[PDB]
Each structure stands twice: as C-alpha cells, then as structure tokens.
Design a protein around this ligand. Sequence first.
Ligand SMILES: NCC[C@@H]1CCCC1(F)F
Lengths: 151, 40
Amino acid sequence: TTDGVYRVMTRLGSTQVGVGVMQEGVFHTMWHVTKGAALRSGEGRLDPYWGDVKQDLVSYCGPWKLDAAWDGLSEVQLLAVPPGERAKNIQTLPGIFKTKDGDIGAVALDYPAGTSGSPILDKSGRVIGLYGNGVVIKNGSYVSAITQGKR
Amino acid sequence: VDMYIERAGDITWEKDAEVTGNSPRLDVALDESGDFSLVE
Ligand SMILES: NCC[C@@H]1CCCC1(F)F
C-alpha cells in the first residue's frame, strides 16, 4: 500500500507485464496491462474500482488520484521500470499529439512492453501521466502519449 | 493466472538522469478502442 512505483507481474515462471503507481492508497495502471483483473499484493488483494478502455486506464482500491499535467514547455522524466532492471529516470522534452479534442504531450521513447504503466514526472516529482499507449512513426519509432486520468 | 505487484522504487525526479529522445509534433486520432492512429 506504500506510495511508489510497482512492477505488475504474472505467472511456470514469472513475467513482467507492466508497471503502476501507488498514491493515496490507490493503484494506477494502464487497462491494456491488466485488462482490469484483480491484483495480488503480498497476502492482500486489490480490486478494480474504475476503468476506461478508451483512456486505457484503470484504478484499484479507489478513484483515480493523479491529476498533474505537462506544462507544455518543460522537460519531463520517464521513471522507467523495465523488466529485469532497476527503476531508472529518463529525461526528455515531450513532443505533441494534436487531436480534434486538443493536444496531448507525447514522449519519443521506446522501452520494452513490460514498461507500460511507468509514470512520467514533472520537475516537482508529480505524476503527469503514464507511459505505454501511443503510435508508430517512420522506421518503427514508437511515441507514447502522456496518458493522464481525471481526478 | 496470478497477477501480482512488487514495489520497485520511490516516485522521484533524479537530477542526474540520462537525457534523450526527440519531440515530434504528430496529428493523431483516438478511436473507441483506445488506439491512436496517424492522421493526414
Ligand atoms: N474486472 C472488471 C474490470 C472493471 C469493469 C470495467 C472497469 C474495470 F476495469 F474496473
């Protein structure tokens, strides 16, 4: 239940399917990581509380708590938790997804799929969204939206 | 299928982070299934 970034694992052996954020007693990850299934945490169970396929987000134990947003000018850090690797910070200036409904920050970083759900942070350390829903440009370069929910 | 979580770190900015990646500006659409696609 401790605040932090967490691996999401599945079981023969174990595999890391994604990443999520614990904040204010609520676990935040991407829908495509868990498909809304319940999660084990030690001897306890975390049940899904809210989710939305179009936003590709799900929260456990309570409503979505993360509400900070990219300021549109400043560099950010992806707190990547790749399978088999220590959590590490990658700093970048986001590009932009321009959509009919407005602009979304986007990071042109390509990490293994099990990194989906890793938080993207602003300079004050607030989570401005999660990594791992995006689009491919030319030469197989992946670009991830900075996906944020509503509090 | 046991899905479970393991803590991996604090949520902190790191002053000494590796810096990389471009900042592309892309026109995109988001469909009902949550999939982004390019638009021209
Ligand atoms: N395990 C069921 C998944 C639920 C119902 C839709 C939203 C949700 F993901 F929380």
